[PDB]
Amino acid sequence: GLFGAIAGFIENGWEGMIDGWYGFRHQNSEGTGQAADLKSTQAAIDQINGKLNRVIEKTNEKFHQIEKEFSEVEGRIQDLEKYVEDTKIDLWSYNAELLVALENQHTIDLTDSEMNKLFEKTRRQLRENAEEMGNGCFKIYHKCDNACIESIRNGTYDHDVYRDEALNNRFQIKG
Amino acid sequence: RPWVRGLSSRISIYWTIVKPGDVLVINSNGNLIAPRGYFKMRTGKSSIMRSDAPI
Numbered sequence A: 001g002l003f004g005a006i007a008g009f010i011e012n013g014w015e016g017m018i019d020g021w022y023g024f025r026h027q028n029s030e031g032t033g034q035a036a037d038l039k040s041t042q043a044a045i046d047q048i049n050g051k052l053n054r055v056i057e058k059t060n061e062k063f064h065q066i067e068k069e070f071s072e073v074e075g076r077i078q079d080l081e082k083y084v085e086d087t088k089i090d091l092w093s094y095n096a097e098l099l100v101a102l103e104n105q106h107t108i109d110l111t112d113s114e115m116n117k118l119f120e121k122t123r124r125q126l127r128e129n130a131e132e133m134g135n136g137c138f139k140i141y142h143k144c145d146n147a148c149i150e151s152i153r154n155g156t157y158d159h160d161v162y163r164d165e166a167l168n169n170r171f172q173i174k175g
Numbered sequence B: 001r002p003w004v005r006g007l008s009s010r011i012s013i014y015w016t017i018v019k020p021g022d023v024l025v026i027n028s029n030g031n032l033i034a035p036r037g038y039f040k041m042r043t044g045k046s047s048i049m050r051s052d053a054p055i
């Protein structure tokens, strides 16, 4: 949660959303249902499988090298043949033990991105038409339903046309 | 030298490679354990490994 979102302010875990890596939950008149996404689910996983291909299955094929285990005390060259190979392992390790640290931490602020860039999208295609109820979930003024849902859940939403319930239930009702 | 396989004396192995267009010359007045020929010299990609794993 560098971007904040995940494990940030959406502090709840979506239990068993198996139809993908993302989605929504509509509380319309027709009851409920947690819907699955794409351009974000394929989006992130697009990248993860990208930095990875980079890592996994690639370089290095070396044939004849220096010996590294030794049967009798030789001194000098010996010492050296060690210290050289030792230094190698040693370095190569730190490169490894960080390729992870990095790729790993940023693997994160990459998922906690697609989130904080979708709620941040819905909250764009629709004006005063609704607001994320407090935090996490949203709040609607129209009687949106399963059919009406394929609006935002398809970016097919008019905050102009389908606007009727605006000021109203908002700051308009008694107080 | 210590008794090895009966014998108390021994041999010292040495090597010499001759590049195309050069001649080899052996000159001994004793103890020469001369060679019967040359081994071919490849460049390739081979090595050797101490391991007890089975093929």
Ligand SMILES: *[C@@H]1O[C@H](CO)[C@@H](O[C@@H]2O[C@H](CO)[C@@H](O[C@@H]3O[C@H](CO)[C@@H](O)[C@H](O)[C@@H]3O)[C@H](O)[C@H]2NC(C)=O)[C@H](O)[C@H]1NC(C)=O
Binding pocket: B001, B002, B003, B008
């Ligand atoms: C220099 O000294 C060494 C040792 O003091 C001599 O070597 C010993 O030589 C004898 C024969 O000359 C070897 O004896 C045989 O040993 C076997 C092994 O157990 C046994 O089966 C035979 O019946 C016999 O006893 C003995 O192994 C060998 N010892 C060693 C470790 O070398 C060497 O010959 C001496 N050189 C000269 C010119 O004095």
